[PDB]
Design an enzyme around this catalytic site. Structure first.
Site, PDB file in Angstrom:
ATOM      1  CE1 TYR A   1      -4.127  -1.649   0.051  1.00 17.94           C
ATOM      2  CE2 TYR A   1      -3.070  -3.082   1.642  1.00 17.94           C
ATOM      3  CZ  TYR A   1      -4.105  -2.812   0.779  1.00 17.94           C
ATOM      4  OH  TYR A   1      -5.129  -3.710   0.639  1.00 17.94           O
TER       5      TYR A   1
HETATM    6  C1  LIG Z   1       2.069   5.837   2.975  1.00 12.90           C
HETATM    7  C2  LIG Z   1       1.753   6.738   1.805  1.00 12.90           C
HETATM    8  O1  LIG Z   1       2.300   6.105   0.603  1.00 12.90           O
HETATM    9  P1  LIG Z   1       3.673   6.638  -0.051  1.00 12.90           P
HETATM   10  O2  LIG Z   1       4.783   6.191   0.877  1.00 12.90           O
HETATM   11  O3  LIG Z   1       3.536   8.145  -0.127  1.00 12.90           O
HETATM   12  O4  LIG Z   1       3.751   5.989  -1.415  1.00 12.90           O
HETATM   13  C3  LIG Z   1       0.240   6.953   1.638  1.00 12.90           C
HETATM   14  N1  LIG Z   1      -0.478   5.723   1.905  1.00 12.90           N
HETATM   15  C4  LIG Z   1      -1.753   5.735   2.290  1.00 12.90           C
HETATM   16  O5  LIG Z   1      -2.219   6.640   2.974  1.00 12.90           O
HETATM   17  C5  LIG Z   1      -2.598   4.571   1.823  1.00 12.90           C
HETATM   18  C6  LIG Z   1      -4.024   4.692   2.247  1.00 12.90           C
HETATM   19  C7  LIG Z   1      -4.872   3.495   1.863  1.00 12.90           C
HETATM   20  C8  LIG Z   1      -4.096   2.212   1.759  1.00 12.90           C
HETATM   21  C9  LIG Z   1      -4.154   1.381   3.017  1.00 12.90           C
HETATM   22  C10 LIG Z   1      -5.543   1.356   3.636  1.00 12.90           C
HETATM   23  S1  LIG Z   1      -5.626   0.439   5.193  1.00 12.90           S
HETATM   24  C11 LIG Z   1      -0.074   7.486   0.228  1.00 12.90           C
HETATM   25  O6  LIG Z   1      -0.698   6.733  -0.547  1.00 12.90           O
HETATM   26  O7  LIG Z   1       0.313   8.636  -0.047  1.00 12.90           O
END
Ligand SMILES: C[C@@H](OP(=O)(O)O)[C@H](NC(=O)CCCCCCS)C(=O)O
Ligand SMILES: Nc1ncnc2c1ncn2[C@@H]1O[C@H](COP(=O)(O)OP(=O)(O)OP(=O)(O)O)[C@@H](O)[C@H]1O
Ligand SMILES: Nc1ncnc2c1ncn2[C@@H]1O[C@H](COP(=O)(O)OP(=O)(O)OP(=O)(O)O)[C@@H](O)[C@H]1O
Ligand SMILES: C[C@H](OP(=O)(O)O)[C@H](NC(=O)/C=C\CCCCSSCCS(=O)(=O)O)C(=O)O
Ligand SMILES: [Mg+2]
Ligand SMILES: [Zn+2]
Lengths: 259, 51, 50, 521, 442, 50, 50, 50, 442
Positions: free
Chosen positions: I366
């Site tokens: 994710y």
């Molecule tokens: C961590 C961060 O990802 P990056 O490290 O920026 O790629 C961030 N994740 C999220 O918030 C994912 C939200 C949904 C996925 C999991 C749900 S439980 C995002 O997509 O910007």
């Protein structure tokens, strides 16, 4: 001192632009529209009634002591305190005597405390109501800056600056503020500049003949006078463009040696 | 514009300098505005000045 | 211009705010909707007392 | 003690001694009256005392003696010299000499109030409350203080029916009272009042007068008040001067002075009778409502049936805010009615006039001329241009000069005065000379129906009788019909014949001016 | 030294102060006054105690039209005021000889807190002031009135407002002259956030002082952006000196020469002055007359044109006594000058483009607001590098109360807070004095 | 309480002209699950039928 | 989500005050009904009398 | 108006090759009638080279 | 002055330096070394000269896989690095003694510049350094190799990638330790935008130095965010002293006592030391015989738990020699400490939750990635205020090469540029010296 040139060029169009820009050039008048008639076409106030005010007169209001602000003499409409109104003009591309950027430059060179706005099919000047009426009668309507056929005082719906003229040589009007009276040969304004009908139609005069319109216009046209016949204006435009480019690149004297 | 460029410069026949920019842009602008002046259908199609 | 500010920039209520950073989004996106705003969106207090 | 002195000052305007040998003294609290004919120099003298641009003396000077804080720039009353500041420092006494660039001038100029003649110094779009609120906040006070005053004040000039009403949409004397209530609320060292009551009706004038006393005479603020209408000069001033053409014809106790002035006077000219000729106008259920989503409905005209009978002089008397100006604008086809019929018998056909256009209202509007209560001229044009070229005179320009001179003479100017006035600007005239010029501008086109909203108001009895015989002669020698809105009763008795009373947009009863007088009292 | 340019400094009344002052004496990198204004802007926080009391009493936390029932606290912040200010000063105190200053404004209803420079010396951005003041104010409110532990979130919402959800201070009662660094138009745009109305209200509606304030902030921002680096530094220093600080009395001289004049007369006087001073010379004469002009000193010609631009705005807006003319005056001043001389305008057309932006922003239904809310951190007004904004201050100073966006309506708190400092109320005089203090080191 | 955070949001979403009625969110998700919910934003009048 | 995303609440009290005072145009319930007809025509894709 | 100065500029906010320019270029971020033709000019730079 | 608790000082080798040092001697508001680190981190810019030459030679402007055919420039910047550095120093110089230094790294391949402090005194933020360096480099490249006027745009694109279009520095060859202000996830988070790989490469993979660097940056950031003011300041001061500087040699002693141990053995060592030092006492004994503990000193117990957390991370990731264990160790150190003692975790469970999300985004599809790309500005690791990032730095220091996104892969220019300065490379031995310099002023 410095004797001010106003516009480059040798053609009649450049000469007309220089004449419009010159505040010491007396524009030739071609019609007599009375002051109350200009007020009625303007549609802002009833003629004979007092000007509405937005603030008390400048003597009544108390301001802070400012040496630089008090150096400039205010307008009479600013001294009494009057609302800021507008007068809007549309100019045809087919040899109208005044043109929007030419109108704005001449207004800002000739009039005090005005707000000029330029569009492709629109030109508006804003000022205090008394002074605005004064230069609307003295310069904007009765002189060679106005032609009742190829130009028109119109707000609201503006369209027809790039369209062809009608059978009477007038600019197209979607609201038909001014019509042609063939019995007298004159253009009569049946509506004001915004569109409500007038109780009495007002004669703004007859259309200027096309031969005079060729001499007094400020637009460049292939069927009239083209810029290819005026290489001095193109050279000045190219010099301005090159100077802007060189200043934006590196604004030093050595980079301007290639100007 | 392509015909005027190929008649006197070529497709890559010149190095980008100020003079070629002024010459080509001025000539094409003058031609386009002359075509707008000569043909009222072209002017009425592009009725707005921005177009 | 003053009337334009008074009519479309004075009392505008948006559903969600813009989000910064790596969650870059404009307004009216579901990440910008507060919990109270969404509680006010649902209309069960109108028709129910439970 | 002494507030300001006036040395021997002779004000001239290019071989024009508007004023010469003017000198009076005032102390901390006293009302001074300036009584004289029209054009005597009262407005020039009040702008002179105010220190406005262009009113600098050529011969004399006036001294203002005030109190002053060198750290706060608050000017005060001279009596404050010896008392404790609203800041540090104690106070200092200054003999500010105006027209001498004496710093304090600025602060003193801020501390003096002026009621301009026929000029409403209000913000227009700032309602009634915010206009008065502004006055308080501007001058000082505070949330509560301001609020208290604002309310206590709106009561004095009587404006509780127009509180949230926009002051631009007010009606004449209402704007006058608004400007007044703005003018007490600054704590002045001097209140210069030029025609403080205005063309105000007896009752409202009485309220204004008491409001003035209730405030300025309580705070012992010296008063310089002009009225060339005496009954106020007496009921207000104790020491009054009488000047004639810029020269003090007398300087005495106000009572003696008013007596002497009134002797110089003349009675009316009770003209001969006239028979009138057929009905010309017929208004049936004319209503005019000004609805707001924020202030309520103002039913200005509330159902009005009137008839005018052709060559006749019709009067419209009433109280301020009754709806006379709205009615007269409905007659002149300026303001359309919200409801109701208006037909004008052009010659035998009755054109429905709540229909715009040359085919309909225009037909009669060629012969309808209106003089507005808030009149204006063209200030960038001369007087001759105003009569002839500004409105459009159907004659060559060489022969328009003597036509304008004849119209000015018929209005009531002499040949020398009309000759000297032609090459002049409206800013160089007096309020009353401008009013007569606007009346001549209405009259010179010779319309059939003429509407005159308050022709008098700033005319000595003599000038008023003049304008009066003018209207009468033109009605008979030119069979011109007139509609008159007025507040002077004797003008209605000796001029009008079938006046009507307006009260809250109604017509109550129409009849003879004497019958209207006994209905009123 | 590296610049041989000398300027003569004048006050706001047009009187001479000193001659042969070096050009770098007014530089943001040398002037102590400009440094002091930058530090004071970075560390000054305005607190609305009356707004906090009103928000907590009615439960008006959140934003526009937001109200939470049941989360209402009845405290008296205005009545206490001095105790809250003392607690905030004690919390924000670092050393005893600190610059921590929490003063009381308008009788307890507002606070003007200045956080110490010690907390800003170890901060990468200026936001430490507002966050530290918010934390100190929250602690002071919780300790002064015994707020329950379950209402500290309500206190935080009343003070700051939607911050963890909305990365800004929207519905709160704490304000600064600078916005959030993540809400900038470009990098280094933090100092172009003060609007025209704030500058006018801070200078008490004084023309030259508001011009000096706007020019100092704009040109210090161009130094911050890296724009005034290398070959552009001389042009930005000359622009600052001649447009904001009235170098060689150019603005006052042009205004005095055009008291009755128009914009075109101002253009004529500017061309005459530039010819007389040797700044511009004749390039060549065409066949139809029209002797072309070229700059002998490009940056000096730009500075002369900028001073004339300010003077033209002052002349036209003092004639009209209305602040609505700014866009047209700048636009057609540049247009008339360019097609009169064949010379470039102010900022080589960037001033004209920003004037077109002002035109469409303040004259149409597509527009929004008046000229009083013009700031360089806006997409409409960012294009000119400190040459189009200081004339708007002169325009708003010449306004006779005919604008809806008056300085009184939008900047009363800003004026009451920042008018107490001498270098902010009269920036021109103290910047001139600071330049005089460092004359001999060049 | 009649509302939670914004009275204006509460009144606005009480509009009967909304295609999704927020009075019974559980019931309409059932309607969309049974393919009997008429949604908006379909470009059926600018698309070919084949 | 579509109904929440497409909702904007704008207040018309500063606009009415600017129309009444600064623009000099009366604001009646009839004028508000006319404006509502105009915006209902113009909001989806409409152009009034063009 | 600011174009000629910003076309060959080297300053941080103003310099960018036209291939690397876009609607988020600060001069280009407000106005219709420029961006689509800017993309065509950027293409025509490489169409001449083949 | 206001804190009467003293600390000892130990180096990275566990040797005693001094005793009875006041707690405020290591405060960011007082320590001269921390102030100098913050000032120098705002003015130091990393320049890739070989990257500039390679980008210009192949036309690689634009970013990821972007080539512009025709805009190719053949320069020799690495060979002329001395002249380029001299011109950059000449352009960036304010006075002649300004702390401007442009040092040559790796034989002209890299350039480390330091813009003068006086350029940042009048700047509201830290972006003036990179923009000024970019402009100076552009002018130096234009005047060194006679580049045409129509190719300065290509030079700008090579130095800064897509800055007017993308508010960042992505495709360029210039870099800094701090990220762009547009990437901040909260106000005051500018010092939190240093990734773990950057801090590890800056300290040359020294565990204690990287812990000190990350702890100093994170706690100075908490001072900047306003979190560590008032009653919250003592907790962050003790967290910086014990977790980051090993004040009472707690970290080294715990690691030495658990050289062949597990996370649980570290937990019992921490509890034993806290009981022996009087930090925690027995609250009550339950019916099952469980001894519930309460803190006699809340902030000291917080600092002891944080130091033990760093020690447990070091022990487990030195046993595994792999940096993928940080999230699990930070999770379960707190998880078994809380249910062994009845006491709260390192940051009252704000750091265990940081590990529960770190365990999400380091082992799932994710987002996130390796532990080296996280930072205090990241949405996953922003929740613990300076108590979870120095463990990640220690673990990445203990990694033997099991990570694809290693500091060598991620931070090659930044690490090589910023390791040339002694203050950034070895923060322990200079922060201790700065504390010793002001030991007697409290
Ligand atoms: C961590 C961060 O990802 P990056 O490290 O920026 O790629 C961030 N994740 C999220 O918030 C994912 C939200 C949904 C996925 C999991 C749900 S439980 C995002 O997509 O910007
Ligand atoms: N600016 C001026 N220039 C020349 N003459 C002027 C000027 N202003 C006023 N006058 C003349 O000076 C005389 C005094 O005018 P003033 O306005 O003082 O009259 P007044 O006594 O107030 O009369 P009124 O009852 O009409 O108000 C009049 O003849 C008037 O025409
Ligand atoms: N445009 C308007 N909008 C709203 N109310 C108005 C407007 N014009 C006039 N009124 C109100 O309607 C009433 C009638 O005004 P009108 O001018 O007809 O009065 P009047 O009888 O002439 O009084 P005065 O003696 O003051 O001239 C006044 O109370 C006025 O404030
Ligand atoms: C789209 C642009 O923002 P952006 O380019 O950054 O996305 C956006 N521009 C505007 O709001 C403003 C004016 C656009 C209206 C022009 C339509 S042309 S038709 C009539 C125009 S005129 O007759 O009055 O001249 C802005 O908010 O700055
Ligand atoms: Mg008078
Ligand atoms: Zn005082």
């Amino acid at each position: 001192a410095y004797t001010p040139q106003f516009y480059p060029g040798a053609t009649k169009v450049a000469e007309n632009r220089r004449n419009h820009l010159n505040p010491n050039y007396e524009l030739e008048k071609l019609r007599e529209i009375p002051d109350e008639d200009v007020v009625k076409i303007m549609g802002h106030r009833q003629p004979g009634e007092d000007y509405k005010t937005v603030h008390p007169p400048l003597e009544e209001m108390d301001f802070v002591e400012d040496y630089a602000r008090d150096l400039v003499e205010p307008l009479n409409g600013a001294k009494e305190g009057h609302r800021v109104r507008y007068i809007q003009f549309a100019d045809s591309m087919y040899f109208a005597p005044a043109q929007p950027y030419d109108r704005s430059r001449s207004y800002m060179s000739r009039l005090r405390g005005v707000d000029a706005g330029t569009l492709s099919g629109r030109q508006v000047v804003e000022c205090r109501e008394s002074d605005l009426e004064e230069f609307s009668k003295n310069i904007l309507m009765d002189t060679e800056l106005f032609d009742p056929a190829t130009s028109g005082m119109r707000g609201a719906t503006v369209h027809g600056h790039s369209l062809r003229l009608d059978e009477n040589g007038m600019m197209f009007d979607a609201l038909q503020r001014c019509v042609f009276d063939e019995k007298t040969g004159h253009v009569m304004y049946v509506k004001d500049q915004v569109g409500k009908p007038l109780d009495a139609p007002v004669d703004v005069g007859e259309p200027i003949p096309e031969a005079k319109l060729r001499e007094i216009t400020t637009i460049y046209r292939n069927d009239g006078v083209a810029m290819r016949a005026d290489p001095d204006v193109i050279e000045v435009v190219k010099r301005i463009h090159r100077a802007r480019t060189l200043g934006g690149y590196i604004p030093t004297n050595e980079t301007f040696k290639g100007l | 514009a392509l015909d005027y460029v190929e008649k006197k410069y070529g497709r890559m026949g010149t190095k980008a300098t100020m003079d070629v920019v002024e010459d080509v842009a001025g000539e094409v602008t003058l031609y386009a505005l002359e075509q707008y002046d000569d043909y009222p259908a072209l002017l009425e199609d592009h009725f707005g000045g921005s177009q | 211009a003053d009337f334009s500010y008074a009519s479309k920039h004075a009392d505008v209520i948006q559903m969600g705010n813009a989000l910064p950073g790596r969650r870059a989004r404009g307004p009216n996106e579901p990440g910008g909707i507060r919990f109270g705003i969404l509680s006010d969106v649902v209309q069960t207090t109108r028709v129910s007392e439970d | 003690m002494l507030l300001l002195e006036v040395k021997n000052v002779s004000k001239s305007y290019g071989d024009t001694e508007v004023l010469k040998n003017v000198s009076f003294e005032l102390n901390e609290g006293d009302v001074m009256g300036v009584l004289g004919r029209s054009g005597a120099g009262k407005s020039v003298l009040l702008h002179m005392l105010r220190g406005m641009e262009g009113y600098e003396p050529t011969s004399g000077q006036i001294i203002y003696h005030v109190a002053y804080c060198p750290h706060c720039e608050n000017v005060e009353a001279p009596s404050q010299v010896g008392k404790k500041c609203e800041c540090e420092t104690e106070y200092v006494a200054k003999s500010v000499d105006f027209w001498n660039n004496n710093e304090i001038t600025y602060a003193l100029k801020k501390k003096i109030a002026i009621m301009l003649q026929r000029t409403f110094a209000l913000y227009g779009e700032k309602t009634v409350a915010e206009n008065i609120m502004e006055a308080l906040t501007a001058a000082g006070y505070e949330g509560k203080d301001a609020t208290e005053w604002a309310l206590n004040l709106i009561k004095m000039v009587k404006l509780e029916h127009r509180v949230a009403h926009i002051s631009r949409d007010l009606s004449g004397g209402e704007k006058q009272r608004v400007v007044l209530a703005r003018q007490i609320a600054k704590n002045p060292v001097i209140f210069l009042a030029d025609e403080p009551t205005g063309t105000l009706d007896p009752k409202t004038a009485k309220f204004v007068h008491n409001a003035l006393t209730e405030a300025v005479i309580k705070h012992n603020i010296a008063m310089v008040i002009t009225s060339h209408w005496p009954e106020v000069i007496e009921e207000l001033c104790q020491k009054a001067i009488w000047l004639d053409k810029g020269e003090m014809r007398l300087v005495g106790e106000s009572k003696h002075v008013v007596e002497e002035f009134m002797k110089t006077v003349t009675s009316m000219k009770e003209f001969e009778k006239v028979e009138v000729k057929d009905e010309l106008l017929k208004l049936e259920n004319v209503e005019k409502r000004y609805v707001s989503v924020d202030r309520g409905i103002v039913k200005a005209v509330d159902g009005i049936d009137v008839s005018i009978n052709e060559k006749e002089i019709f009067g419209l008397v009433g109280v301020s805010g009754a709806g006379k100006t709205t009615l007269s604008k409905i007659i002149a086809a300026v303001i359309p009615p919200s409801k109701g019929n208006y037909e004008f018998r052009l010659a035998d056909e009755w054109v429905d006039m709540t229909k715009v256009g040359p085919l309909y209202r225009g037909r009669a509007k060629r012969y309808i001329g209106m003089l507005f209560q808030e009149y204006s001229l063209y200030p960038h044009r001369t007087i001759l241009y105003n009569l002839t070229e500004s409105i459009g005179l159907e004659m060559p320009g060489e022969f328009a000069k003597m036509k304008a001179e004849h119209t000015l003479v018929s209005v009531g100017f002499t040949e020398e005065e009309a000759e000297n006035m032609l090459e002049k600007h409206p800013s160089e005239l007096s309020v009353g000379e401008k009013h007569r010029v606007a009346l001549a501008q209405v009259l010179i086109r010779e319309p059939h129906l003429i509407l005159l909203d308050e022709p008098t108001g700033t005319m000595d009895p003599i000038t008023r009788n003049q304008v009066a015989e003018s209207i009468q002669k033109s009605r008979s020698e030119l069979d011109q019909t007139y509609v008159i809105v007025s507040h002077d009763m004797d003008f209605v008795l000796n001029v009008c014949d079938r006046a009507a009373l307006v009260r809250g947009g109604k017509i109550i009863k129409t009849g003879k001016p004497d019958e209207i007088v006994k209905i009123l009292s | 030294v590296k610049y041989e340019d000398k300027i003569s400094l004048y006050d706001a009344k047009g009187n001479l102060v000193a001659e042969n002052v070096p050009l770098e004496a007014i530089s943001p990198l040398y002037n102590p006054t400009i440094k002091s204004m930058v530090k004071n802007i970075k560390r000054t926080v305005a607190v609305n105690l009356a707004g906090i009391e009103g928000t907590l009493a009615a439960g008006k936390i959140g934003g526009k039209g937001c109200q939470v029932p049941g989360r209402t606290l009845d405290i008296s912040a205005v009545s206490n005021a001095q105790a809250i200010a003392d607690e905030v000063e004690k919390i924000l105190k670092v050393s005893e000889d600190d610059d921590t200053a929490v003063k009381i404004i308008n009788g307890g209803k507002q606070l003007a807190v200045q956080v110490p420079t010690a907390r800003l010396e170890v901060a990468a951005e200026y936001s430490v002031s507002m966050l530290s003041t918010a934390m100190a104010l929250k602690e002071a409110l919780i300790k002064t009135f015994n707020i329950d532990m379950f209402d500290g979130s309500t206190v935080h919402a009343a003070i700051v407002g939607n911050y963890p959800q909305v990365m800004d201070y929207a519905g709160g009662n704490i304000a600064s002259l600078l916005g959030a660094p993540s809400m900038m138009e470009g990098l280094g745009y933090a100092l172009r956030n003060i609007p025209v109305n704030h500058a006018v209200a801070t200078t008490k509606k004084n023309m030259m002082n508001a011009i000096a304030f706007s020019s100092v902030m704009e040109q210090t921002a161009t130094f911050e952006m890296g724009d005034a680096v290398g070959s552009f530094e001389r042009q930005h220093l000359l622009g600052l000196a001649y447009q904001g600080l009235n170098a060689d009395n150019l603005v006052i001289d042009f205004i005095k020469a055009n008291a009755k004049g128009t914009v075109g007369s101002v253009v004529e006087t500017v061309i005459d002055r530039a010819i007389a001073d040797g700044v511009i010379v004749v390039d060549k004469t065409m066949s139809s007359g029209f002797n072309m002009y070229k700059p002998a000193d490009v940056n000096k010609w730009n500075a002369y044109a900028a001073a004339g631009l300010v003077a033209a705005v002052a002349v036209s807006c003092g004639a009209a006594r209305a602040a609505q003319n700014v866009a047209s005056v700048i636009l057609y001043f540049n247009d008339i000058l360019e097609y009169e001389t064949g010379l470039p305008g102010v900022d080589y057309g960037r001033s004209m483009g920003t004037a077109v932006g002002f035109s469409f922003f303040s004259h149409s239904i597509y527009g929004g607001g008046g000229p009083g809310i013009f700031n360089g951190n806006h997409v409409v007004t960012r294009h000119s590098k400190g040459f189009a904004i200081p004339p708007v201050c002169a325009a708003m100073c010449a306004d006779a109360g005919t604008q809806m966006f008056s300085p009184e309506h939008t900047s009363g708190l800003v004026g009451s807070v920042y008018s107490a400092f001498d270098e902010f109320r009269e920036p021109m005089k103290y910047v001139i004095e600071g330049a005089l203090s460092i004359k001999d080191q060049f | 309480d009649a509302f939670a955070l914004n009275p204006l949001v509460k009144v606005a979403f009480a509009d009967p002209m909304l295609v999704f009625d927020f009075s019974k969110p559980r019931k309409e998700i059932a309607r969309g699950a049974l393919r009997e919910f008429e949604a908006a934003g379909e470009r059926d009048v600018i698309l070919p039928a084949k | 989500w579509d109904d929440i995303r497409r909702t904007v609440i704008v207040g018309m009290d500063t606009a009415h005050s600017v129309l009444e005072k600064r623009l000099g145009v009366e604001v009646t319930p009839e004028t508000i009904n006319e404006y509502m007809h105009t915006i209902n025509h113009s909001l989806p894709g409409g152009a009034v009398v063009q | 108006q600011c174009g000629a100065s910003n076309s060959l500029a080297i300053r941080n906010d103003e310099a960018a090759p036209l291939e690397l320019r876009g609607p988020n270029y600060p001069n280009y971020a407000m106005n219709v009638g420029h961006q689509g033709e800017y993309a065509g000019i950027a293409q025509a730079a490489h169409s001449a080279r083949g």
